[PDB]
Design a protein around this motif. Structure first.
Motif, PDB file in Angstrom:
ATOM      1  N   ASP A   1      -2.399   3.965 -11.448  1.00  0.00           N
ATOM      2  CA  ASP A   1      -1.638   2.825 -11.010  1.00  0.00           C
ATOM      3  C   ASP A   1      -0.594   2.609 -12.066  1.00  0.00           C
ATOM      4  OD1 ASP A   1      -3.517   2.788  -9.028  1.00  0.00           O
ATOM      5  OD2 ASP A   1      -4.555   1.011  -9.762  1.00  0.00           O
TER       6      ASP A   1
ATOM      7  N   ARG B   1      -5.990   7.606  -6.511  1.00  0.00           N
ATOM      8  CA  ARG B   1      -4.867   6.780  -6.110  1.00  0.00           C
ATOM      9  C   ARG B   1      -5.111   6.151  -4.751  1.00  0.00           C
ATOM     10  NH1 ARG B   1      -0.176  11.058  -7.626  1.00  0.00           N
ATOM     11  NH2 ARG B   1      -0.351  11.017  -9.907  1.00  0.00           N
TER      12      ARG B   1
ATOM     13  N   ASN C   1       3.585   1.881  -2.723  1.00  0.00           N
ATOM     14  CA  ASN C   1       3.079   2.165  -4.059  1.00  0.00           C
ATOM     15  C   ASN C   1       2.449   3.538  -4.066  1.00  0.00           C
ATOM     16  OD1 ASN C   1       3.888  -0.230  -5.276  1.00  0.00           O
ATOM     17  ND2 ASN C   1       1.956  -1.266  -4.812  1.00  0.00           N
ATOM     18  N   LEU C   2       1.803   3.865  -2.958  1.00  0.00           N
ATOM     19  CA  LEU C   2       1.125   5.130  -2.842  1.00  0.00           C
ATOM     20  C   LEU C   2       2.110   6.265  -2.934  1.00  0.00           C
ATOM     21  CD1 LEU C   2      -1.240   6.764  -2.497  1.00  0.00           C
ATOM     22  CD2 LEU C   2      -1.111   6.527  -0.067  1.00  0.00           C
TER      23      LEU C   2
ATOM     24  N   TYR D   1      -5.303  -3.029  -1.219  1.00  0.00           N
ATOM     25  CA  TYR D   1      -5.150  -3.263   0.195  1.00  0.00           C
ATOM     26  C   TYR D   1      -6.166  -4.300   0.677  1.00  0.00           C
ATOM     27  CZ  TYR D   1      -5.309  -2.361   5.203  1.00  0.00           C
ATOM     28  OH  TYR D   1      -5.313  -2.496   6.569  1.00  0.00           O
TER      29      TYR D   1
ATOM     30  N   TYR E   1       0.797  -1.215   0.000  1.00  0.00           N
ATOM     31  CA  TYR E   1       0.000   0.000   0.000  1.00  0.00           C
ATOM     32  C   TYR E   1       0.838   1.277   0.000  1.00  0.00           C
ATOM     33  CZ  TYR E   1      -3.258   3.550   1.671  1.00  0.00           C
ATOM     34  OH  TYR E   1      -4.005   4.690   1.824  1.00  0.00           O
TER      35      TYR E   1
ATOM     36  N   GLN F   1      -5.163   2.020  -4.379  1.00  0.00           N
ATOM     37  CA  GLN F   1      -4.293   1.387  -3.410  1.00  0.00           C
ATOM     38  C   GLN F   1      -5.085   0.761  -2.271  1.00  0.00           C
ATOM     39  OE1 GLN F   1      -1.219   0.827  -4.056  1.00  0.00           O
ATOM     40  NE2 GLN F   1      -1.434   1.980  -5.959  1.00  0.00           N
TER      41      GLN F   1
END
Ligand code: 7F1
Lengths: 219, 219, 217, 219, 191, 191, 186, 220, 212
Positions: free
Chosen positions: H49, H71, F65-66, H79, F62, H75
């Motif tokens: 992404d 975003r 990548n964020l 998750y 998470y 994500q």
């Protein structure tokens, strides 16, 4: 203009002043104070031939009872509040509520409504009539003001009752309850009447015995 | 409309801020706060059965710090109570007394938040702030209802402002407690009064003695 | 909302009166042997599932409440009233006395937007059937006999023409069928009415079978 | 512009605050006098209905006094605020509140409502006072929107300016020990005189009715 | 450890020894158990060092808030009562309020673990080393003593408490809260 | 839990056991793989309780990548590692245990090893969190040579694994060894 | 973990051990127990490493940020208030040495949050072993060179004498004008 | 915020739409390789992404918030499901936000109308467009911004379901360039990009872009 | 609450346009981006002005100037710094200038949309350093952050916006860029992030160092 959150250039609030322009539509009710007794009559307006007319009188506690004369919903809300408050009182202190503490509390509620903008002022004014020891009559203007009284009449054509109040001392003939009640029915003139003082607490003689008592003004 | 609320003009310039400054500028309580060499004076006119003994603009917000205030009085007592709150929280958090500008971050920011947020009205008060800094140099700041930590070797506030900047300049060409306080009391005379120095005890901020008011005024 | 008019009447709530005039009519008649409860069933479009829409409802097992005005606001007040007047009986068997169920619904109705509906709640709780109209205004009142909908404007007189306390609930059924058939355009049939009743004995709420109303007419 | 408690006028005046001065200007007078041996707040309420009682004066402790003018409701509520304040301070600090800090507290209380766009400012000016041999008598008058001020006696209410000619004889008003009352009863040409003096044992007290007789019978 | 205080002819005379023994091993010897909550009043403290110090700072800023909100210096009785109500709300410290007040020129409050009593015509003693001195000092007591005379009682009672109580410290600090202005006193040591 | 991270001249190597046994060390699984790739130059090898491992690598998946999408640069290892320490510390309870290992170029190699509270060791050389860690530091402390070719470093890290796995009951079958160079990545299975 | 620091004739001089330990096996050959809170003030914590890295981070940024927000150099006592207040809210001792408008101040801060100003200080397992040699040779207003050699002596003693303490030493002279760090005192 | 029109329409959303039609043009195309999305611009194309990227129009300063939100959603879905988000769901997410703002709130609605395109494996390459209104529709080709119909209708008159990226991008450029000018976009500001499977590899300074700049040698 | 700004029939937000007009009506500042550094300057009697500079240190790297309302600069600068700190706590390193510009841009965004508040009254310049390179981003009141090789913000910058280019011609060295900044700007302030990451304001004496 147009909200109670602001004063007029005169320095007046209009919204709260409109509450009396509400109360004048309401039917008159009148009260008399004998030295040890209080008697409070109402007038139950009948919307139809088949309607049974609503009761102006209530009974907040043993010796306390009230007679709201304004828009009914606010009136019932004040009753539910005053009752819940007297019961909170006794539940706390194993003791009857002070009448004036109550009047001061309900009047605090009025002001809390008539100050805040979002909440509208009440369109009703209670005429409390009770005692924790010695008989009393309080009136609550639809605001934080409240006044004790010797005798009070209010609502519709209460004007007749008001001018008439001067014709008798509140206790020109206090000593007998029948004298008192006859002053009450004169002062006001199915229709309601209620009694509270000394030994018997609040009471509503709306019985047919009252129907008998009705002729006594003309008997 | 844009004027009725704390919002930008078509010209891009804020209104209500100017109006609050008119509140200060029509308050008509002029006050001269001049720094002195290794000291600092803050004076104001103290303006019936009313007590002059009560009246003042100058107020301390710690031992080392004192802030004359001008504007709407309720806002002044509020901004002072806020100031004292501010120094107490900083001391409590950090163990150092605030430098005068550090108190101006709180004064000026709290005074600012009103400006964006449309509801609560813009601040109606302004005034100097004086205090010995951690740097031995005495520190004299100011603030405006529009946010401003300002910064001065000398200042004036109230009905008179930049009218007396050029007047102050004449003292600025001549700018010890004798030497500096006379500049202040004269600056009231130049355009009873109450004088306030940080340099009594050089760090402690105290208004100068009543008996010693006259001697400068008569010298 | 609650901006009091100079005239002294509350503005909003007095504007909200007209919503009941939109109401299709219904006639509740408390009687010595029960409460009769009639309403228009001719409200129906030709293609809605026939007689599949009730004006008259049931707040509790022994309460039945015809509604005025907006169908939606009525559906809500009936929802909360069902909830509360059920919740009253949470361990003790007695269902709420009609006067106090209705007192709940009104005391809520007082205080968004004021409700556009009026109710005509009926039931047997005390030894004797109850008939309570609730005005949108929160004013609460016990008629012996009463009607709702705009047709109640002149149809009400008809009650005054006939209402004696002394009637078999069947006699009362004839009466309310009289007064309500009068205001209908269609000659009354079971598609023109959705009558219900609460007996002085049975005390049970019961919409009539169509065969019944077809039989009396 | 005049429509907000908060929005400033183009000239920086707050008309909505300014109207409270009208309210109080029409509402019932409530002089508070100071003797050089005590303090005597008084009221002249001008509101058969009861005439016997309608006290305006009330205390926050057996020594401090309050009096007001303006809307009854708001001021009664502020009296509740002061009771809760004096008692909060007594719970924290194990002593009775100095009059000064209480006065500033009510200054902040009354001041707060002015800043809020929905909120309506209180409509009642408030006298608050105390007198002890050591705690010399002082009479703080609180005009709404802050700026409480100490006084040697201020008349407030409807006719105060025409009484100020009498109170301005404050040399003679301070001359009295217990006869300032008798002077007042002619001076003014329901009522609620009181006591905070050495004879009062400095504790607040309604003036005795048979002490009220010498005043009324004096002329 | 020990904290004591006896009022001389006029003012208070507080004392303490510093040691700050930590886990039955001395850690920060020659600290300062006595405190300046203000010039008008000083506040001896003993118990856990951390809870005491935090509480000390807290009452300090209440004392200053009160100090300027009303320009008169706060009565020390109020310092006592605020420490009362504060420590009431677990937190734990025992302590001694001495100081000057125009309302009452010399008093000596004493706060227990939770609730606070006074000793106007007496002395206040606390800590592990207190118990030795309660009896010794309450013998030598007489109300007439001037500072030159009571300085001795303070000094010695500290010395006995320190003699036979392991927690009790070395260097000791005392303050002669004079009825008048400044009241200063300097660290001193005997055995 | 068994994880390694050798460093090399132009390389870093990371390795693990592939068993995730349950209570009484019954081997419920043999294909479990603690090593993960947060980035081409960034890896983490988790160990301790496996639930907390998937949850933790999941949260990294998470937040990294964020950040990489929110800020164009591929995250530097110091950032991922200090942030990692920040992550565990918020609550001890979240991992009843976990022992992350962070590895990768930054092209100076970067090898760091967190504790489960987020205590962290930014080593210049090998570090070895895992249930069999003592055997790991034991073999690798002496077997280690400063800089080697990826294959000799491979046989090296493999000898630390081959040695440790045969002393512990909880050590796995296989070895997900993972020598890497900035431009290349060479995973292998050893038995 | 020994950590010893001592005031000289114009500058605090802190010195500390460099060896983390898991309790049985050592888990590091080296660590940083001389964090740099600011140019003229540092902290030397001892205890759980995790809590130490935490509160020293939060401290460093509270102090650097507050320094950005105000003119004054973040005088040493504010760090002490922030730290002690944080620990008071709730396991990690600290020893902080900075130089400012006052003297080269040095503080010691207990796990319960207690604070004390000190002439010279030690914390950790080596504390005892450091109090022995440190106190014996101490003298106020030493030449800073005397700090340079002494603090290393008491550290080395508090190294060799504990199982829980060992490894290379590092020392720094926090002058008000400047810190002067060295990564390996040994 | 504002209530419905007496005719039956929404003022505010019509206003924000008025705002997004004034924005510089963005365009979209689908081919076998992956979606390619043009621009009149400073990146004005952002990746959600790896598999998803969006190309925005409108008051882009408020679009910045929907990129950040987007975003966060993608994500967050990764998750929760250990699977990178299908495009269609992401569009559902953003349009759930936009509808959250147009209805209840008292806040003004977002001034942004943006494209979004990406390769969920399950449904092949995806393309979508959004409105302040909260209406989204799939597409094969789009030309939001100024000259929406003018740049669309060229493709609409000249388009097919499959092309090479190398030939298709030029066909993006026939609209995209002739509308502004025949050469101007590659004379000036411009930003085409695609997802082969991941990133928008073409760059305006990139030599591949010379082919774009060379479309004219093909064009004339 | 209520977004006091709402859309025009013409589609524009008029309020933010007003704030744009205020910034245009407010004081000048320059930014110039040397190949090996960045310089930002501005045109800034009782008042001790030494405490007052539009220049401000967000980090050892980043420095800024606003044009509009000084208290507005104060609060934006405060949140900004608290973000550089919130980041440096969230991760182990210094914030990238682009990231801080993005977070400031979101903070500026919200008030432009979120109910009950007047939109920020000022533009921003944000010179900085990062591993990528020496940076300079201007932030618009709208939330339209933008890269610049150079920029201007304050009054009468229409003609003045076009003097800055010349340093890129052959004056990319800092010492020569200085003239580009001051002469374009022809009180005053200058902050420069040089080949070293730390930046520092040039004193008036050093302002006279280039005045000759
Ligand atoms: C002092 C030891 S002592 C007994 O004198 O107090 C050191 C202080 C220390 C060690 N490292 C640093 C870095 C910066 C500042 C200070 C530092 N602390 C310890 O020795 C800890 C012993 C505790 C019980 C007193 N050791 C630890 O906490 C372990 C450190 C660790 C474990 N694995 C690692 C890999 C790489 C680098 C370090 C480590 N870890 C734990 O004890 C695990 N805890 C369990 C409970 O608390 C949180 C994690």
């Amino acid at each position: 203009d147009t909200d109670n959150i602001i004063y007029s250039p005169e320095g007046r609030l209009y919204q709260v002043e409109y509450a009396s322009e509400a109360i004048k539509q309401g039917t008159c009710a009148v009260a008399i104070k004998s030295k040890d007794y209080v008697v409070v009559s109402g007038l139950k307006k009948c919307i139809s031939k088949l309607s049974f007319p609503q009761e102006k009188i209530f009974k907040i506690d043993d010796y306390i009872g009230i007679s709201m004369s304004g828009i009914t919903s606010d009136a019932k809300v004040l009753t539910k509040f005053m009752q819940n408050e007297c019961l909170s009182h006794k539940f706390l202190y194993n003791e009857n509520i002070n009448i004036e503490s109550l009047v001061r509390s309900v009047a605090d509620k009025y002001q809390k409504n008539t100050q805040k903008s979002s909440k509208r002022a009440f369109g009703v004014g209670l005429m409390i009539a009770a005692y924790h020891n010695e008989p009393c009559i309080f009136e609550t203007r639809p605001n934080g003001s409240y006044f004790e009284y010797d005798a009070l009449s209010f609502g519709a054509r209460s004007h007749a009752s008001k001018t008439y109040l001067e014709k008798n001392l509140h206790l020109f003939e206090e000593c007998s309850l029948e004298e008192l009640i006859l002053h009450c029915l004169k002062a006001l003139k199915n229709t309601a009447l209620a009694v509270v003082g000394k030994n018997h607490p609040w009471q509503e003689i709306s019985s047919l015995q009252l129907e008998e008592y009705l002729s006594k003004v003309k008997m | 409309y844009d004027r009725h609320l704390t919002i930008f003009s078509p010209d891009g310039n804020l209104y209500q801020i100017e109006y609050a400054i008119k509140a200060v500028k029509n308050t008509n309580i002029t006050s001269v706060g001049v720094k002195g060499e290794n000291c600092a004076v803050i004076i104001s006119q103290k303006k019936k059965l009313l007590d002059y003994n009560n009246i003042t603009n100058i107020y301390n917000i710690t031992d080392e710090i004192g802030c004359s205030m001008v504007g709407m009085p309720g806002d002044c007592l509020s901004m002072v109570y806020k100031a004292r709150s501010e120094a107490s929280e900083f001391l409590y958090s950090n163990g150092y007394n605030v430098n005068a500008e550090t108190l101006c971050r709180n004064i000026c920011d709290k005074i600012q938040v009103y400006t964006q947020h449309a509801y609560m009205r813009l601040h109606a008060c302004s005034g100097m702030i004086i205090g010995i800094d951690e740097n031995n140099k005495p520190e004299l700041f100011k603030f405006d209802p529009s946010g401003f930590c300002a910064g001065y070797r000398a200042c004036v506030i109230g009905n008179k402002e930049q009218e007396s900047i050029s007047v102050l300049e004449r003292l600025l060409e001549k700018r010890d407690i004798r030497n500096t306080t006379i500049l202040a009391i004269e600056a009231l005379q130049t355009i009873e009064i109450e004088v306030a120095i940080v340099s009594t005890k050089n760090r402690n901020f105290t208004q100068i003695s009543e008996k010693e008011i006259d001697n400068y005024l008569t010298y | 909302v609650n901006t009091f008019s100079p005239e002294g009447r509350l503005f909003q709530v007095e504007y909200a009166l007209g919503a009941i005039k939109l109401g299709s009519t219904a006639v509740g008649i408390c009687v010595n042997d029960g409460v009769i409860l009639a309403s228009e069933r001719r409200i129906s479009s030709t293609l809605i599932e026939k007689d599949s829409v009730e004006k008259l409802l049931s707040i509790d097992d022994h309460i039945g409440c015809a509604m005025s005005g907006l169908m939606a606001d009525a559906r809500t007040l009936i929802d909360y009233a069902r909830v509360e007047c059920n919740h009253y009986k949470f361990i003790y068997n007695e269902n709420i006395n009609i006067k106090s169920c209705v007192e709940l619904i009104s005391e809520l109705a007082l205080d968004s937007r004021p409700f556009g509906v009026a109710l005509l709640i009926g039931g047997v709780d005390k030894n004797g059937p109850c008939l309570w109209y609730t005005e949108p205004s929160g004013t609460n009142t016990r008629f012996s006999a009463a009607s709702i909908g705009s047709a109640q404007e002149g149809a009400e007189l008809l009650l005054q023409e006939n209402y004696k306390k002394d009637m078999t609930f069947e006699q009362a059924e004839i009466l309310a069928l009289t007064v309500l058939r009068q205001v209908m355009e269609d000659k009354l049939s079971t598609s023109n009415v959705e009558i219900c009743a609460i007996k002085k004995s049975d005390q049970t709420f019961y919409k009539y079978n169509t065969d019944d109303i077809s039989r009396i007419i | 512009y005049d429509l907000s408690v908060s929005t400033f006028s183009p000239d920086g005046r707050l008309y909505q605050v300014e109207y409270i001065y009208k309210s109080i200007n029409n509402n019932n007078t409530a002089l508070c006098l100071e003797c050089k041996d005590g303090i005597i707040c008084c009221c002249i309420n001008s509101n058969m209905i009861k005439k016997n009682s309608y006290n305006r004066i009330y205390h926050v402790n057996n020594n401090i006094i309050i009096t007001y003018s303006g809307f009854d409701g708001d001021a009664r509520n502020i009296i509740d605020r002061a009771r809760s304040e004096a008692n909060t301070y007594y719970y924290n600090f194990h002593t009775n509140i100095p009059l000064h800090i209480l006065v500033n507290r009510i200054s902040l209380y009354i001041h707060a409502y002015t800043l809020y766009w929905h909120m309506r400012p209180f409509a009642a000016s408030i006298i608050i006072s105390s007198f002890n041999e050591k705690d010399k008598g002082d009479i703080y008058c609180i005009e709404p929107n802050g700026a409480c001020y100490k006084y040697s006696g201020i008349v407030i209410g409807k006719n105060k300016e025409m009484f100020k000619t009498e109170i301005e004889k404050k040399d003679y008003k301070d001359i009295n020990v217990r006869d300032a009352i008798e002077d007042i009863y002619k001076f003014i040409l329901l009522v609620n005189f009181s006591w905070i003096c050495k004879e009062s044992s400095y504790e607040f007290q309604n003036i005795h009715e048979e002490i009220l007789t010498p005043a009324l019978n004096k002329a | 450890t020990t904290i004591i205080g006896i009022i001389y002819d006029n003012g208070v005379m507080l004392a303490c020894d510093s040691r700050t023994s930590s886990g039955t091993f001395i850690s920060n010897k020659c600290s300062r158990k006595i405190n300046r909550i203000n010039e008008n009043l000083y506040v001896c403290r003993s118990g856990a060092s951390a809870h005491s110090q935090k509480i000390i700072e807290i009452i300090k800023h209440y004392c200053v808030s009160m100090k300027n909100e009303n320009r008169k210096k706060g009565r020390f009785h109020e310092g006592e009562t605020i420490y009362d109500e504060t420590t009431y709300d677990f937190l734990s410290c025992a302590l001694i309020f001495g100081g000057y007040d125009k309302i009452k020129k010399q008093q000596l409050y004493a706060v227990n673990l939770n609730g606070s009593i006074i000793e106007k015509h007496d002395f206040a003693v606390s800590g592990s080393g207190s118990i030795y001195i309660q009896s010794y000092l309450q013998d030598k007591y007489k109300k007439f003593m001037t500072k030159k005379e009571c300085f001795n009682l303070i000094l010695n009672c500290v010395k006995y408490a320190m003699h036979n109580d392991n927690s009790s410290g070395g260097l000791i600090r005392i303050v002669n809260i004079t009825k008048s202005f400044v009241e200063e006193f300097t660290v001193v040591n005997t055995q | 839990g068994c994880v390694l991270g050798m460093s090399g001249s132009n390389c870093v190597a990371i390795a693990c056991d592939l068993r995730l046994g349950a209570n009484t060390f019954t081997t419920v699984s043999t294909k479990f793989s603690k090593i993960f790739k947060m980035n081409n130059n960034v890896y983490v090898g988790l160990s301790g309780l496996a639930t907390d491992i998937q949850t933790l690598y999941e949260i990294l998946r998470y937040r990294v990548n964020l950040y990489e999408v929110r800020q164009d640069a591929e995250m530097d290892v110091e950032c991922f590692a200090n942030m990692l320490s920040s992550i565990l510390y918020s609550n001890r309870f979240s991992p009843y245990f976990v022992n992350p290992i962070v590895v990768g170029f930054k092209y100076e190699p970067y090898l760091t090893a967190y504790d489960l509270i987020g205590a962290k060791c930014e080593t210049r050389d090998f570090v070895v969190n895992g249930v069999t860690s003592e055997q790991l530091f034991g073999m690798c402390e002496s077997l280690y040579v400063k800089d080697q070719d990826e294959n000799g470093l491979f046989e090296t890290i493999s000898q630390c694994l081959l040695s440790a796995l045969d002393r512990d009951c909880i050590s796995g079958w296989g070895a997900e060894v993972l020598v890497l160079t900035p431009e290349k990545i060479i995973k292998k299975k050893l038995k | 973990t020994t950590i010893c620091g001592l005031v000289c004739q114009n500058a605090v001089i802190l010195g500390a051990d460099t060896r983390a330990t898991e309790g049985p096996i050592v888990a590091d050959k080296n660590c940083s127990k001389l964090h740099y809170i600011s140019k003229n003030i540092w902290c030397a914590g001892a205890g759980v490493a995790g809590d130490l890295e935490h509160t020293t981070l939060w401290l460093q940024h509270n102090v650097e940020l507050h320094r950005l927000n105000t003119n004054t150099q973040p005088r040493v006592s504010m760090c002490v208030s922030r730290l002690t207040q944080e620990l008071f809210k709730y396991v990690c001792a600290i020893v902080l040495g900075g130089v400012d408008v006052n003297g080269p101040q040095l503080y010691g801060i207990h796990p319960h949050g207690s604070s004390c100003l000190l002439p010279f200080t030690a914390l950790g397992s080596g504390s005892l072993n450091a109090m022995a040699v440190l106190e014996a040779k101490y003298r106020d207003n030493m030449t800073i060179e005397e700090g340079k050699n002494l603090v290393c002596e008491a550290i080395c003693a508090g190294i060799f004498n504990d199982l829980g303490s060992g490894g290379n030493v590092d020392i720094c002279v926090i002058t008000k004008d400047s810190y002067q760090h060295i990564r390996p005192y040994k | 915020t504002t209530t419905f029109s007496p005719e039956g329409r929404l003022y505010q959303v019509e206003y924000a739409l008025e705002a997004i039609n004034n924005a510089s043009i963005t365009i979209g195309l689908i081919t076998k390789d992956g979606v390619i999305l043009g621009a009149d611009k400073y990146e004005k194309i952002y990746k959600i992404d790896k598999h998803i990227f969006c190309g925005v129009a409108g008051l882009n300063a408020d679009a910045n918030i929907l990129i950040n939100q987007s975003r966060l959603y993608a994500q967050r879905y990764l998750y929760n499901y250990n699977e990178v988000q299908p495009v269609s769901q992401l569009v559902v997410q953003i349009c759930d936000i936009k509808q959250s703002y147009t209805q209840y709130g008292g806040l003004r609605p977002y001034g942004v109308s943006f494209l979004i395109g990406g390769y969920d494996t399950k449904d092949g390459y995806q393309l979508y467009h959004t409105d302040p209104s909260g209406n989204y529709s799939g597409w094969f080709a789009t030309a939001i911004g100024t000259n929406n119909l003018t740049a669309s209708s060229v493709l609409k008159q000249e388009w097919k379901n499959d092309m090479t990226l190398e030939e298709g991008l030029l066909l993006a450029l026939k609209t995209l360039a002739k509308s502004t000018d025949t050469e101007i976009p590659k004379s000036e500001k411009i930003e085409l990009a695609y997802l082969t499977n991941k990133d928008g590899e073409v760059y305006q300074k990139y030599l591949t872009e010379k082919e774009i700049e060379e479309l004219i040698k093909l064009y004339t | 609450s209520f977004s006091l700004t709402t859309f025009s029939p013409t589609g524009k937000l008029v309020q933010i346009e007003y704030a744009l007009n205020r910034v245009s009506s407010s004081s000048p500042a320059l930014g110039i981006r040397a190949k090996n550094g960045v310089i930002i300057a501005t045109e800034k009697e009782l008042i001790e002005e030494n405490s007052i500079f539009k220049i401000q240190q967000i980090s050892e790297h980043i420095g800024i100037v606003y044009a509009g309302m000084p208290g507005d600069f104060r609060v934006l600068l405060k949140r900004a710094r608290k973000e550089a700190i919130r980041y440096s706590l969230q991760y182990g390193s210094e914030i990238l200038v682009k990231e801080l510009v993005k977070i400031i841009a979101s903070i500026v965004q919200e008030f432009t949309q979120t109910g009950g508040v007047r939109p920020f009254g000022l533009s921003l310049l944000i010179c900085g350093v990062d591993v990528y390179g020496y940076h300079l981003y201007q932030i618009d009141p709208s939330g339209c952050y933008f890269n610049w090789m150079a920029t201007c913000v304050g009054k009468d910058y229409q003609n003045n916006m076009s003097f800055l280019e010349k340093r890129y011609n052959k004056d990319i060295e800092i010492e020569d860029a200085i003239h580009t900044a001051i002469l374009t700007l022809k009180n005053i302030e200058i902050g420069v992030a040089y080949d070293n990451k730390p930046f520092k304001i040039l004193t008036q004496n050093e302002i006279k160092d280039y005045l000759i």
